[PDB]
Point group: D2
Chain length 359, copies 4
């Protein structure tokens, strides 16, 4: 269990960017720029720096060429320069490996701290960043599938309560979670910026990065991403969706980049900024908790996720989840889910909803 430091937590504003390692920079560029329409802030033979339509900081995504595709850093902006020092003192008191660079780890970020956090995740904290042209009224550039904001990260970790307590001490507040009647926690969402989440924990073998999520303005923007992927004859890279989430109430889609990094496209969750924001707990067997329309969750969504790196750029070793598996207890041969609690009609036993079993 992770103790609460005596040192004050840094004041975290929001998720700000991820740095993903990618194996073929040109094919990743085709996906993020040509298919998804993200905006280039800088690029060279080694890296592509990308931002969403409404962003003013330098980037939301950095694609770094390297030998092994993986999450290199998930970065949170903090409220003041001094909060970077606070983060350093906090993680040092946790006994975590830290690395400070006064001039940043990536272009367009200044003074920055990277840490191997207690769950094995590479986090960055920074304040200083190079401001760029905010493209939010550049409707001459606007795509039918325009990605407007970075919304959140989602992390796979074997012990959700242990992770949750740690993120609570860091100032994140839980908005929604998924549990069962026998006291197991399968997932939790938690926030700083007043949306449903900034980062989220998914119970599973880890550390691994489940996804990075971008917003659109409207639902039709997400439908267009699907339609465009069908036109490009890359519908096999649509993993799951589109749907309505139970948890978050957002309209969603999950797609896969060329190195199998999962991207969620997301819109229209709700305000969580009040400090007594009501938490919402879903039962793991509730077949409307993940897709509100009861569509089945593809098993890859539960099993696959990206490697993460340590601060030397080596892959973090995986620790196996010992708590019950969400896949197994819902859609596996011994699983079940319901539409109405207590009702056998519209319940599924040993298979997924809507007439499928696991492939």
């Amino acid at each position: 269990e992770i103790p609460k430091p005596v040192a004050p937590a840094p004041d975290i504003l929001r998720c700000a960017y991820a740095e993903l390692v990618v194996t073929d920079l040109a094919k990743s560029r085709n996906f993020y720029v040509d298919v998804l329409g993200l905006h280039v802030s800088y690029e060279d033979e080694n890296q592509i720096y990308l931002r969403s339509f409404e962003e003013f900081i330098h980037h939301n995504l950095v694609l770094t060429k390297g030998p092994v595709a993986a999450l290199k850093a998930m970065a949170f902006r903090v409220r003041t320069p001094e909060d970077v020092d606070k983060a350093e003192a906090y993680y040092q008191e946790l006994g975590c490996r830290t690395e400070r660079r006064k001039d940043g780890f990536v272009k367009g970020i200044g003074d920055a701290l990277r840490v191997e956090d207690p769950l094995g995740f590479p986090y960055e904290f920074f304040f200083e960043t190079t401001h760029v042209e905010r493209l939010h009224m550049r409707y001459d550039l606007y795509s039918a599938g325009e990605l407007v904001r970075l919304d959140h990260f989602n992390q796979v970790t074997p012990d959700v309560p242990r992770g949750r307590k740690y993120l609570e001490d860091l100032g994140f507040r839980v908005t929604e979670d998924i549990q069962d009647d026998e006291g197991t926690t399968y997932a939790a969402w938690m926030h700083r910026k007043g949306t449903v989440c900034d980062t989220a924990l998914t119970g599973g073998n880890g550390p691994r990065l489940h996804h990075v999520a971008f917003s659109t303005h409207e639902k039709h923007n997400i439908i267009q991403i699907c339609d465009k992927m069908g036109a490009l004859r890359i519908s096999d890279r649509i993993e799951r969706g589109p749907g309505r989430h139970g948890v978050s109430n957002a309209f969603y889609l999950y797609i896969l980049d060329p190195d199998n990094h999962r991207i969620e496209i997301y819109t229209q969750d709700y305000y969580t900024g009040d400090p007594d924001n009501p938490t919402i707990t879903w039962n793991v067997h509730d077949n409307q908790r993940r897709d509100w329309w009861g569509n089945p969750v593809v098993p890859s969504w539960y099993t696959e996720a990206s490697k993460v790196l340590d601060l030397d750029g080596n892959v973090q070793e995986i620790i196996e989840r010992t708590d019950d598996s969400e896949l197994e207890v819902t859609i596996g041969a011994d699983g079940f889910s319901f539409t109405r609690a207590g009702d056998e009609d519209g319940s599924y036993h040993g298979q997924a909803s809507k007439g499928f079993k696991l492939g």
Copy 2:
């Protein structure tokens, strides 16, 4: 093969309404009025007459209480009173049983002809109908999920080419179809009114009624239907979707009424009214043909459909399809689909797409 009559075909305008027999009238009313928001033109203890938002004829759907749920009639409006005479002559020459009622079979329809057509389907032809208030600008009534039009029927019949030729002689033109490279036709869509279809043929055991389709204005209206079904905790009645079709290019959803009658909600197909409108043929193994995004087609979609009645009100005997089954050749044990023709990557062998197998 069904011979082309010497008598001229009636001039058919469009699909106009269906009469469905339902077992529990109040339950069916709850589905079509309270859930789906159709507008009541008349009701009593035995029948409910319903219309869409933009209709000016009396009704698009009649629900009739009876002991065995079934399609009782699928009704087409014809251009002139004299076309009802033409229909009668045409079907008599085809050797079909016909019944003519000067004052209609249902309220709000006048002179009408019902026939047992050569595929065993109960068709009605009429011109005369009581006009009602067209609600197309009654935005004080407009629901977030509003059904604006009746769009089409879809019929299950064992021999698609045989039915297709008959419908072409009756003046329907095929807009799209699904075939393989071995001479088999699995489905065809055909129209009079200048949309992708007024009726359609789906290969399988029949006669059965696959579905009735209603349109919305926008994609978000279909999303709202799903969202409402979730809120009402009847997401188990969402069979398939929502999705983008390959065939038709429409956004779509399939739901199931209380007697398992299938209803499609549909929007934004394209204009077919030119007489040389290009006919689109999709290969049965193309995994974007039914769902453009590659989502799997649930097996119930292929296997389940509604009984149809003869003119005496008895269920028509089902004739088994002997041609290859779309289910079997795509998602069955010896099935195959592709995302990209000739590419093994994104292809599926003996299972469905997106990680699923047949339950």
Copy 3:
């Protein structure tokens, strides 16, 4: 009155394309292709052939460079090759000038008949056309403002009843109109393809072309055209809208091309294909008849319209409307409009709505 021929009317399917004369081919290209996202079927130094996202015929719009900006032809497609024969006999019986070309007037159209119709408009009738790739599922090309179909034309003509009867004899059915309680007709809409219109008559000095209309799938696609025009700092080419029409019930926008040819963007009208489709009549003083939300109609919308050419490429002389003017009776100095019939509250006297 224009007499009804003995000769059978051609079977007309739909409005199919317009040929517009433009003065600067590059500026017009920039409008129609870069701003509006229409798709190029063919172009050379003299002409650009454009189509909408869902079209399979060769084009919906031909831009032709010339000295005087004008409508050169409004073309309708007919059901069969023999319908072009029918059209020719029909207009000859009306004593109209016709010209027939077995290989088309423009690329991608085969046997075609052009006429100076009894209202002074250049109609084309054709069947044969070169099929192209239908781009209806090319979502890799789809724009946030995508124009998906050609929907209709709208014509300015001084005597609407006279024009109406002629179009009815040709097989068009009136769907909606605007009249007053004094026997005047101000506008009418009429159709072949089963939407609210294929062509429409606006009462005014004419012959002039009021607009050409293109459809989008959704209302947000029209919003995006406005948003883009703001970003391009060309919001002054937004004439009117966006709005909901009373007449047609469609969501709409009117914008102006570089030669002031007016383009409507339109979506979500209703099905008119039944032969007893109920005709809807609006009173001219009903302030919800043109914009359902009661937004005022700018005077330029009533006064400005494009010249049309005769078959020699010369401008048609404009004949003055003597019937009452829609502008004058609604928003002129002695104009009137109401929100609720018989209610003084929400009525406007001698001025337009909303202040």
Copy 4:
């Protein structure tokens, strides 16, 4: 100037509700419930309490029957119970009239402070509120025009700089404003919750309440409100729009309730939560600043606004703006605007646009 108190500012979360006095409660209920679809949290013969689709606090709007239509209180939720004490000490130091009710002024609110603020506006600060069913997934109730969140207030005040500095001291940050080259400020928008605003200042005679704004999910929801008003033959109560704002980038509509209280419907502004969020200044003569599509702003939008009440429930006397008028410099007889700066083509002189 309004001096900065030494006492700490209350930590304000967001705009939370407005209490509007209405003269005919049944007519007002018809507008807010039957036309606009707000959800009833409580009602009796004297008041109706209403909330938006995604709200969990007791209400976002209280309609109170009374003799004179006016804003009675604009209420902000604060972060903790002790922030109500800080608010009291803060306004007391400012020299303002205050009133504290430990059991609230309206149902469903607990310990609350109302103040006559330095600009003459009745502000309320509270933490405690009765939680209700959050209806955010009640799609069985969802209307085609659904109002999903209370978004902000907009105040008319004569001296925008004076009010801006006061609100900045209270922790609001300016996100956008409208100025001219001669140094006049005509309006400013400022936030606590990380949208473009929680309250906004419009230059004019005041104190008056310009509008209260509610959000929808999508732009079609706003279109529907207009369409419904047409069907109900009350299109005369659509004042301005629908449009795209320059300021805020939001899609918008303005409508008038039965007492002429102005309601904005609003969607899809942008994130402002970072402390160095770039502030955007528009020139008053830019015809895309208010409606991005260059549609003209009707004069009523500039000249009409709601009375506000003092703590005794009497109407606050109005102080006339002495700075230049946005109406006069853009659409009045000596006014002008441009589409492109420096370009006479697309410019308007002594008239509005279009």
